[PDB]
């Protein structure tokens, strides 16, 4: 089995922009993979101070 973490392109991945702008091969994604995940960041008042307490 394979576990892959393809790092995105310059800056944040623009969610208003189209995907497959930082992924390289579409042929692996269409049927040669099964499921995807994502690690987006949104500025949140409540969660990030706990995340600040998570690291401090």
């Amino acid at each position: 089995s394979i576990l892959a973490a393809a790092n995105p392109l310059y800056g944040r991945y623009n969610p208003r922009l189209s995907p497959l702008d930082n992924i390289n091969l579409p042929a692996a994604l269409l049927s040669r993979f099964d499921i995807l995940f994502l690690m987006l960041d949104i500025p949140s008042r409540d969660d990030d101070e706990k995340l600040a307490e998570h690291v401090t």
């Binding site: 042929a27 269409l30 049927s31 040669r32």
Partner: protein
């Protein structure tokens, strides 16, 4: 031949070695085995098989019987199954003495929906022919196909190994990725489409060697 799974029934021995190349001095030995028996793991044409297929040849639905036999798991799709066995039944070399030199080999292709056993059918064709090829993802290239100079580790000299298109002398060339293939290559297959040969322009030697070949193409959308 080199490169197979093997089992040997060997005895045991050991030899001395000279340290300096020009004296009789010798002391860490080297062992080696001596084999007594080794094991890996025009056909003899009988007449009961010819009698058995003539029963099948008596059956008119052999086209439909070969339509259903090629798919042990594949969905029905009768149209693609026509030419595949037809290309496997690859004609003959109807060659004249003077003029012509035509050969009855043809070339089918397919493209369309991604991963519809596009590869496993090609794997299934690789089952049914014993002497064939199998393409790779940049295992062969423009200069990596034939026309070699390579400095081998045994003698550091020249070796001219044939490409896969010449290597299918008695098979069917199964080849893929015909929308991502580089345009340095995808220029010599027109010659084997037309003059059935490969012209080699290498520093070693010139040769117009032929290639008794037969091709199918498995493209991809964009």
């Amino acid at each position: 031949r080199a490169g197979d799974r093997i089992e040997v029934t060997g005895t045991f021995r050991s030899i001395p070695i000279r340290a300096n190349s020009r004296q009789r001095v010798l002391s860490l030995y080297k062992t080696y085995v001596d084999v007594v028996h080794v094991k890996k793991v025009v056909r003899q044409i009988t007449d009961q098989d010819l009698a058995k297929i003539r029963e099948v040849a008596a059956r008119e639905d052999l086209y439909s019987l070969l339509a259903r036999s090629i798919a042990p798991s594949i969905y029905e799709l009768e149209d693609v199954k026509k030419g595949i066995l037809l290309q496997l039944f690859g004609g003959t070399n109807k060659t004249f003495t003077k003029g012509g030199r035509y050969r009855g080999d043809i070339n089918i292709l397919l493209c369309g929906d991604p991963s519809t056993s596009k590869s496993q059918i090609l794997q299934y064709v690789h089952k049914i022919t014993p002497r064939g090829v199998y393409t790779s993802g940049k295992g062969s290239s423009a200069v990596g196909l034939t026309a070699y100079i390579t400095r081998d580790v045994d003698t550091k000299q020249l070796v001219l190994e044939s490409g896969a298109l010449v290597l299918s002398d008695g098979g069917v060339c199964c080849i893929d990725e015909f929308d991502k293939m580089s345009d340095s290559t995808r220029s010599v297959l027109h010659e084997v489409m037309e003059q059935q040969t490969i012209s080699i322009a290498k520093a070693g030697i010139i040769t117009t060697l032929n290639a008794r070949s037969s091709i199918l193409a498995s493209a991809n959308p964009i």
